[PDB]
Amino acid sequence: AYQGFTKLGNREPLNDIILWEQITPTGHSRKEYTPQASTEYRVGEVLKADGTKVQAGEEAQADSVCIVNFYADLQLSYHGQLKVVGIHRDAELKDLLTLEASVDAAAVKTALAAKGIDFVPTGL
Amino acid sequence: MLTNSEKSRFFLADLTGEVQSIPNTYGYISNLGLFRSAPITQTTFLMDLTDWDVSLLDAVDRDSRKAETSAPERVRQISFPMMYFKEVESITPDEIQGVRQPGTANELTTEAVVRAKKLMKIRTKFDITREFLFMQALKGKVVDARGTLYADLYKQFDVEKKTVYFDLDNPNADIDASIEELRMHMEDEAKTGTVINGEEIHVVVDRVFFSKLVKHPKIRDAYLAQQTPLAWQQITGSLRTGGTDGVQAHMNTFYYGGVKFVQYNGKFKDKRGKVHTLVSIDSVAATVGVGHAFPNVSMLGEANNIFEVAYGPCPKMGYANTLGQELYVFEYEKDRDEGIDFEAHSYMLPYCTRPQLLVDVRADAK
Amino acid sequence: MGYANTLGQELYVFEYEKDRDEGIDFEAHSYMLPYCTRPQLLVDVRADAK
Numbered sequence: 001a002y003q004g005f006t007k008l009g010n011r012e013p014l015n016d017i018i019l020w021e022q023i024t025p026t027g028h029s030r031k032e033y034t035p036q037a038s039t040e041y042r043v044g045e046v047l048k049a050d051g052t053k054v055q056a057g058e059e060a061q062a063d064s065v066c067i068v069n070f071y072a073d074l075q076l077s078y079h080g081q082l083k084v085v086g087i088h089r090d091a092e093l094k095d096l097l098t099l100e101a102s103v104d105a106a107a108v109k110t111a112l113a114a115k116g117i118d119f120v121p122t123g124l
Numbered sequence: 125m126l127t128n129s130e131k132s133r134f135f136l137a138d139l140t141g142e143v144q145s146i147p148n149t150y151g152y153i154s155n156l157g158l159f160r161s162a163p164i165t166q167t168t169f170l171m172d173l174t175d176w177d178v179s180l181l182d183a184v185d186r187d188s189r190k191a192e193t194s195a196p197e198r199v200r201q202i203s204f205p206m207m208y209f210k211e212v213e214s215i216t217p218d219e220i221q222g223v224r225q226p227g228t229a230n231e232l233t234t235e236a237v238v239r240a241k242k243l244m245k246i247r248t249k250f251d252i253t254r255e256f257l258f259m260q261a262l263k264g265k266v267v268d269a270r271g272t273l274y275a276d277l278y279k280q281f282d283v284e285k286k287t288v289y290f291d292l293d294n295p296n297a298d299i300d301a302s303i304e305e306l307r308m309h310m311e312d313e314a315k316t317g318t319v320i321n322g323e324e325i326h327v328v329v330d331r332v333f334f335s336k337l338v339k340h341p342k343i344r345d346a347y348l349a350q351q352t353p354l355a356w357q358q359i360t361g362s363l364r365t366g367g368t369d370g371v372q373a374h375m376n377t378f379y380y381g382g383v384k385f386v387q388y389n390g391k392f393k394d395k396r397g398k399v400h401t402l403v404s405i406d407s408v409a410a411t412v413g414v415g416h417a418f419p420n421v422s423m424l425g426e427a428n429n430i431f432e433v434a435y436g437p438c439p440k441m442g443y444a445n446t447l448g449q450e451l452y453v454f455e456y457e458k459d460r461d462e463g464i465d466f467e468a469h470s471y472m473l474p475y476c477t478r479p480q481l482l483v484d485v486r487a488d489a490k
Numbered sequence: 491m492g493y494a495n496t497l498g499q500e501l502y503v504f505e506y507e508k509d510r511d512e513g514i515d516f517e518a519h520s521y522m523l524p525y526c527t528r529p530q531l532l533v534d535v536r537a538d539a540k
Binding site for chain 2: 001003004005006007008009010011013014016019094096120121122123124
């Protein structure tokens with residue numbers, strides 16, 4: 001290696017944060033978003049109503065939590081689906097949120113809790 | 125056999141032969157057998173790393189019916205390059221036209237003798253390079269004698285390095301404390317998932333460190349006050365009871381606290397002219413004692429070998445995807461019977477899979 | 491190479507190919523020196539006065 005080491009990257013997070021959700025013939029707690037251009041999505045990310053991620057100063061606009069890893073350059077998810085899917089209604093999720101820079105986690109959690117989403121405190 | 129006299133061509137004197145001086149070679153590590161041979165058919169290789177951890181559990185109220193959960197594991201991947209070595213040599217008729225053999229009177233040199241000598245020199249050079257590379261790998265960073273950096277294990281695997289200070293200069297300093305620190309580090313930082321005995325380790329040190337350790341008052345008095353063969357042998361016997369390196373028939377050895385200390389004098393010269401001591405530590409004055417510690421093979425068994433060597437294929441035709449060999453030697457004939465030219469090739473990289481188990485030892489204190 | 495310390499010869503001749511069968515090459519070698527061990531017996535003769 002030029003620097004003495006090479007790193008091929010870590011495995012993307014797997015969709016296992018869901019501990020409980022409302023089962024229904026059609027997904028009652030799941031919603032579909034049109035993927036925004038040139039945006040990379042990963043499990044545990046917070047999205048606004050329009051499908052864009054939540055940045056600092058707008059935590060009150062948090063709408064849903066992403067569930068599928070989406071590759072922008074392919075315009076296709078890792079499961080071959082055309083759309084992004086996120087949780088937007090009552091459910092229990094592992095406390096493994098991924099947030100942008102300078103985003104206050106507490107505000108996001110309070111905003112989401114109003115929709116019935118609770119976070120189980122994960123161990124180590 | 126008779127030759128011309130010193131100051132007259134008409135008188136003869138008797139020649140009694142030759143005496144040869146051969147440079148020293150050491151090759152100590154190469155004989156321990158620590159490094160296994162792992163030939164491969166490619167110019168690179170990969171590895172997978174898996175990690176997980178656990179923590180204590182917090183009490184919750186019975187009626188609330190709340191609970192806890194554990195985070196998932198982390199998987200990662202890495203890669204390695206490899207080092208290539210090559211050298212050339214040739215034989216021409218001018219080397220055998222009228223050139224007397226050193227040990228005789230009127231016998232001429234022949235192609236066979238030059239061939240054998242040059243091949244032996246090539247093999248010696250490659251052995252020296254292999255020993256140097258093994259020692260560099262054991263230090264934790266693989267760098268060519270030219271100074272190029274090829275592998276940095278402490279960065280390839282995200283981990284740091286530990287140094288242990290003995291403070292042998294202080295008359296009141298305790299050594300058992302440092303030995304226990306080393307043992308606990310080796311026992312705790314493995315994270316192999318099984319029971320580990322840290323008593324199984326090699327400790328190779330230099331001359332100054334060995335002398336300071338042996339002559340410390342606390343060790344000397346303690347071993348002097350005991351009536352047992354080990355005490356007698358070390359205090360007033362000969363400490364040279366170890367194995368053989370490439371030069372001397374026994375290596376200085378010392379026993380204390382269940383640890384075995386060995387003195388290694390190996391050193392080589394770069395073609396730039398400088399001297400590369402094998403046991404030294406980078407950027408530390410040679411006046412300070414220095415050593416290196418690493419686990420034994422039995423500390424984990426062959427099922428979990430830690431040291432390996434990889435061998436790649438030769439660039440020439442007919443070896444596109446072969447398994448690879450330690451050394452290749454080829455010969456070709458020059459144009460219109462002008463001479464012979466040789467070539468020797470090598471392609472290897474030694475590495476370690478758990479670099480955090482390599483600990484450096486120092487005689488000073490900080 | 492094959493003649494480094496062999497006895498001399500009146501005339502050496504060698505043949506070599508030119509690769510890819512485009513022709514053949516020839517060479518001739520000789521390493522000679524004539525001499526006389528009684529030079530005092532060699533005399534010049536001239537048809538002119540002193």
